[PDB]
Amino acid sequence: LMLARQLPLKSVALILAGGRGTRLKDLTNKRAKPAVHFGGKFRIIDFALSNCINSGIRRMGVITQYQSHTLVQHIQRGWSFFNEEMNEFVDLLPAGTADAVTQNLDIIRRYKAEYVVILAGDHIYKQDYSRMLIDHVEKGARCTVACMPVPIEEASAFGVMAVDENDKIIEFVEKPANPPSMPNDPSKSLASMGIYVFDADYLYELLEEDDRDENSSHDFGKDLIPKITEAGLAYAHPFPLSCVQSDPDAEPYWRDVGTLEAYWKANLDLASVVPELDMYDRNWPIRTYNESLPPAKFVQDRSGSHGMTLNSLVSGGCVISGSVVVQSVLFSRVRVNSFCNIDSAVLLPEVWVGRSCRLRRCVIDRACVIPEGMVIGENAEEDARRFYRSEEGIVLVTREMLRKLGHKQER
Amino acid sequence: LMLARQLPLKSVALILAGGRGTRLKDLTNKRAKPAVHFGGKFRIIDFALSNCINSGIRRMGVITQYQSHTLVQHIQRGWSFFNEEMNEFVDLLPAGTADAVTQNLDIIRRYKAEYVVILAGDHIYKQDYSRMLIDHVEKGARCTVACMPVPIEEASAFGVMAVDENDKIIEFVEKPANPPSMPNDPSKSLASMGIYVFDADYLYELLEEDDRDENSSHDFGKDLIPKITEAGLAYAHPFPLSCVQSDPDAEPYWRDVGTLEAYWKANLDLASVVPELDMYDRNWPIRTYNESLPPAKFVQDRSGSHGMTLNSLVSGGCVISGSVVVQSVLFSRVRVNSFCNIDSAVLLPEVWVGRSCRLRRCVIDRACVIPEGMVIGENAEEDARRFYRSEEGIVLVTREMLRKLGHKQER
Amino acid sequence: LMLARQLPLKSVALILAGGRGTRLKDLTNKRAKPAVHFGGKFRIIDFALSNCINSGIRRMGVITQYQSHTLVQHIQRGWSFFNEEMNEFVDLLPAGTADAVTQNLDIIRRYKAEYVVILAGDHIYKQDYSRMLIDHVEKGARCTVACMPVPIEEASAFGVMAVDENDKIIEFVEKPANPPSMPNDPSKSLASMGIYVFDADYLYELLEEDDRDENSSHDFGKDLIPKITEAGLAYAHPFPLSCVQSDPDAEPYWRDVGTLEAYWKANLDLASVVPELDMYDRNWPIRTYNESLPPAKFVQDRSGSHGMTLNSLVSGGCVISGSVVVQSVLFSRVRVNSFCNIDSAVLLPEVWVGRSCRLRRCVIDRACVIPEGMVIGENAEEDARRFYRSEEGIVLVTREMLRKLGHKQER
Amino acid sequence: LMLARQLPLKSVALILAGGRGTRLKDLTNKRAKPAVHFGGKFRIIDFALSNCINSGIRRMGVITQYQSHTLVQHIQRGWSFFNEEMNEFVDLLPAGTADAVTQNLDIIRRYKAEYVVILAGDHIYKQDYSRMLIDHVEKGARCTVACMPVPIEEASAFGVMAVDENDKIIEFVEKPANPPSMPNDPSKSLASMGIYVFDADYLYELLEEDDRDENSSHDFGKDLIPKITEAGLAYAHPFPLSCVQSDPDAEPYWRDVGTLEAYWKANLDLASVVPELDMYDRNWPIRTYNESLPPAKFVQDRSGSHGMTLNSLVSGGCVISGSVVVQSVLFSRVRVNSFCNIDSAVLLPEVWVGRSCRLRRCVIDRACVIPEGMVIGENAEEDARRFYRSEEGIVLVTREMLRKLGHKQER
Numbered sequence A, B, C, D: 001l002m003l004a005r006q007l008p009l010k011s012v013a014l015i016l017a018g019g020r021g022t023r024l025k026d027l028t029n030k031r032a033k034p035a036v037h038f039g040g041k042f043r044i045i046d047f048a049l050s051n052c053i054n055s056g057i058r059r060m061g062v063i064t065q066y067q068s069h070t071l072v073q074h075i076q077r078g079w080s081f082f083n084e085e086m087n088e089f090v091d092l093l094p095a096g097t098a099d100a101v102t103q104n105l106d107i108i109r110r111y112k113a114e115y116v117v118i119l120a121g122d123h124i125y126k127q128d129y130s131r132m133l134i135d136h137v138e139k140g141a142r143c144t145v146a147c148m149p150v151p152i153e154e155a156s157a158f159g160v161m162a163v164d165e166n167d168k169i170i171e172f173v174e175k176p177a178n179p180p181s182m183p184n185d186p187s188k189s190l191a192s193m194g195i196y197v198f199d200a201d202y203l204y205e206l207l208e209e210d211d212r213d214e215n216s217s218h219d220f221g222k223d224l225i226p227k228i229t230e231a232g233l234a235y236a237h238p239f240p241l242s243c244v245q246s247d248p249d250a251e252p253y254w255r256d257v258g259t260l261e262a263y264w265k266a267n268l269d270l271a272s273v274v275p276e277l278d279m280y281d282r283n284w285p286i287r288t289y290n291e292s293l294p295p296a297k298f299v300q301d302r303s304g305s306h307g308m309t310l311n312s313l314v315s316g317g318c319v320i321s322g323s324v325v326v327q328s329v330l331f332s333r334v335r336v337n338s339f340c341n342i343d344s345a346v347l348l349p350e351v352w353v354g355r356s357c358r359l360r361r362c363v364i365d366r367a368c369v370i371p372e373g374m375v376i377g378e379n380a381e382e383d384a385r386r387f388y389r390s391e392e393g394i395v396l397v398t399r400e401m402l403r404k405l406g407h408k409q410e411r
């Protein structure tokens, strides 16, 4: 009795916003991945922060290895309603991942937390960490990992594990070439999610042992979790027990955005008729730096004609004139002149599309300025020559790609 | 030299948000007029507050006679980003109008301001008051009134004046039946705007003289301004000298929203191709309770068909499905199911329109829930019976009106 | 499991900050009692708000029936850390005590809380309401009252009750002339504390029944609690189960400041060697509007001599020169010139004491300006003539008394 | 007319809070110099920020070039009250001196500011920059430098200049070995203050051109100001025209805190009877992150004896018992047990002094824990052996020094 409320108070979160995502070729060149925009007005890291608040954890330690400017500006601007007088703060702790928490160890000790929540903030999900902690304490563990079945065809990109009846870790392997399958199913492999919970005093004792190691890669998956697994102190936490989902019949939603295609497919999943991820949830609202923007102004074309939309999102500040829109997502302050045709696109902020454009299966970067008459996504080899094109068919367009093409982005 | 900066630092604004917007019949029944929504995401009072900030005046005294909760929430949330050890504050001073500033006289003195800016916050405009204070000091005046020519056909609703070559007040009359016309034009009458500037020590001396008067109506226009005009200490300030207009060639924008038709016509003026009021202007921005809303989600109808829009605004949180929209303004969190036809409407927040509705020249009040099949604006006598209809043709729709009609509005 | 964390989120607090504080004769005439300053920089209402935060309840509804100006200022400055996404917000709901709640019923329905916490914010205490909600739900109750034993000699000022073995309410009487004593002790009477917890749907159903009552006093103690007691649905919650106290051996701290002597005695209780109330708690802190003040500047007198202090408090901004201080509490921006002798005093903010004063058992009101040579607390009849003096011996000094006396306070 | 109001709105500040602080050898090893505490609760950088607000510049760009966490935490907590819609914010732009402002050129342009104010935020002063901008535009300069006469015995640590009758720069030299004296006085040298004002367009071209130089040190003083001086476009701005000072007869206050002695002597200047720097100025106040702390609690010693103070400061949260204090400055949450004797010290926050200590001419670092019986400042050779001792006589004590001495600071 009186445990669920108490446990978040004694813990602190360590978002590992390292922004690698090397598959996002040029999208993360000038910004860490956690600060990638997603679903209108949000960043990715808000999904990690908002799950910390709504789960009760109001002490959060961001660890931006990249030392990025936009992430700092976002945390500073949006997540700046906290006062340390009440023991609620977002701490920016600039610097393998595991070593990165060792340099800021002397600060983390000053929090004097009993437990800690390691998070990878370059993911999209909803989870109630308090429900995870309860499962950590009831088992009397030292390390609680968030496990989730995934297809074996991509299990090589995560850490795979094998558990007993009591969710105790028996075997663990980090990024195997031939992932072991679950015993009751060959087509899937129980995978880690980059969400760990540690009892603090064990971690501090453990990291120093790793800091002195001359061979450790200083990574959680490759160095520490196998060591704890050898020690027999690690336990698992099936993610569906904690996944916040309106429909209990639906599957858990955890989207690794590691590549471009999944970024596009995940942003458009919002625009569909029945989204898998519900932002309208009022019991788990997601927060962000919400700048003041005028309403989404649709207008008539130069010819006085109307504009069509079909299964699309339109943020604040946008401006659209005529210009058939389909299956697309328009971020803030976008401008779309007349006679355009946009189909299954993702337009990041402050874009300015000219007249008579035609876009199909594209991802436009921030503040690009497409010229008049540009056509994208209809001829593969042409688009591959000008811009980057993935094997799936998706196209990416950044300021530099156009800059080299001779168009002007000064505006 | 160094004067324009020093002057706003010695002055404080007094917004008279009494909001006795009687001609707004039922729209202001449950809320003070300043807290009326206008333009998508804005109240009316922000126009008075934002002009005080952008003119440098960061001490503002809101004088909410009505003692509303919504206005106090708006000020508390949206406009309470201040630090008071730096002498910048929005202050709520609850209680004719002259007497409204006399009860809080003891509180006002403590600011120790040399000048004061009287404002009526139930109007819409943009003005740089530092440009007014400069014209106040250069003239060595004690009262500076903001004068603006207006059509004589409606000059009876304002205070009329007659000035000399030096903008000194010669004759003043408050709300005449036969307004005198300007000398150089019969069709117009130089009118007051409800914007006054007083040298502080004079005002305090003057109001006490009025408070002891057993016959004064305790109102600025009917009691004090005639007294100062008799004293020959009042001077005028033509509003074009201070009107912040993006397009210099255009005429100054001052909309008295006193009646319903002007509210509708002013909100739709935004939606036009070339708005008279530019809120996109970044050299004179306007603030508000910028709440967080998911993007404007357009979708397909039940039949999988598309949706059209034409010269319209769409706030955040809205949801539209098919449903042809024209010339309309949709405030936040509005839901519009399929087969609708909306034409020159103004839909305040949280409305829920059912299927197969048809709206024309209407104003929906907050959080109404229209039932399925409703038709508005096509038959005058029917709409006059069910709802309130103005002589111009405009229609007003309130929660109570439909409650009386029998459609349950609990949601 | 997992019910403790979700109990606060589903509830909302209703601070009844409308106390007349009639027993405090002139201290609270110009300010509502909750806004009375206490123990340095804090007000009284912060103890109610800070217990709501630290118990998890982040939705708070203030009610300000009488002299609602300073309180609004404080709430809008100190407690304007609004984050409407996650439904954590301090709300201002201006208008017997129940009557005040009913008028704002339609708003309270908009919070969609399962439970509600009624509080009297004109008291001083520390409590963890989540530990009350747990005791409310485990008993399966509908009304949970916070009970505390008190001396029978003053039990007439509170509501007395008599309970069975299971903390169920058997008998209840509001403010009796002859308080019934507890059965196991004649010298005490189990009393209410003005802290109630109601399951929301029961309250809304219940208040309308009371609103239609033509004879009810519209007060919680005299009308509703006897009704629920007759229904046999009220249960008690002994406060020691929830009192936050560093030393478990000490008694619970609940100070009704209802009279002047208790206000003085409570403020000086801080200054003692071992305070009964501990503000130095990292685990359970108390917030307030903390303006940037310079540090407490002690200096030399006109004669170059030193200043002594003994068991005293000194806020920020203060300035003490020489001037022996004892057992006293100095609020912010106090100024104390030389040759003074202060013994067991309570000096509210911005006081300016002149030279060669001598104060003993006094309470100075905000922003008074004592003249040179004034002597207080040494001759009873003289002090009774000039100022207000209580039967215990304490003296109160407001600006008005001095203004009448002839020492101007314009400074 | 209307110029001084309009000028700050078009300008932006660039705080160069990247100082290595080599001269403060141990104080700033773990923190940037701007984050050094000063005068109770303040940080040095607040003097530059508060001068930007109170001079009207509400766009400020901090440049935390290295070893900065504390600074980010201070800005993020205390100084983040972003408007962001009115165009007022505190940016953080992490990275010679000119390289720091070159790398963030892309971000800075985005402001579209006509003028810019280069500042060195590792100084203490009060200045109204709008008076500087007025003096900048009236002269038609492209670079305005803040000039101040200083003693020639230390002019070698600053940039020296020589001007004509119209404050135009004739000769300039950055950190000379033999400083030239002013013509009308040999004992002084007109020196730069690290406060520059540039017309924005000229600055970007100037910086871009500087970037390509393979021999420039990328510093303002050594590279750019000589180049502009050669061009004859640089003008001076005598600091007394802009120095904010209560007493006009006093000298201008600009304290370079470059060494430890000046840090001590400047903090103790506050504690004197008549401070040179006035924090008690309502018309020109200075902000800071002000955590809510309880009042300064003085108490009795173990023997029940009293405590003396003489020309001292005591912040909030402090606790003092007996323990004669003289000429000293006690920062927040200080603890001082009995029988202590403190004379002309500077105790940074969270210090814990044991019993029977004796301190003289010392500077204690944040969060030290002095042991019982320690004596400092009475035997020079002993203190030089244990801690750092300056040539002037001042002593610096930090945690690391104590840690090596065998004491334990784990508390």
Ligand SMILES: O=P(O)(O)OC[C@H]1O[C@](O)(COP(=O)(O)O)[C@@H](O)[C@@H]1O
Pocket (backbone or CB within 6 Å): B106, C030, C031, C035, C070, C366, C367, C399
């Ligand atoms: O006669 P006055 O000038 O109104 O003074 C009465 C006193 O009451 C107060 O308004 C009380 O203020 P607060 O309760 O808001 O602290 C003082 O500021 C004021 O000096």
Ligand SMILES: O=P(O)(O)OC[C@H]1O[C@](O)(COP(=O)(O)O)[C@@H](O)[C@@H]1O
Pocket (backbone or CB within 6 Å): A106, D030, D031, D035, D070, D366, D367, D399, D400
């Ligand atoms: O880092 P050390 O050697 O443990 O010393 C610790 C102390 O120094 C500090 O880092 C000083 O930091 P600041 O200068 O940022 O206030 C404190 O955070 C801490 O209490």
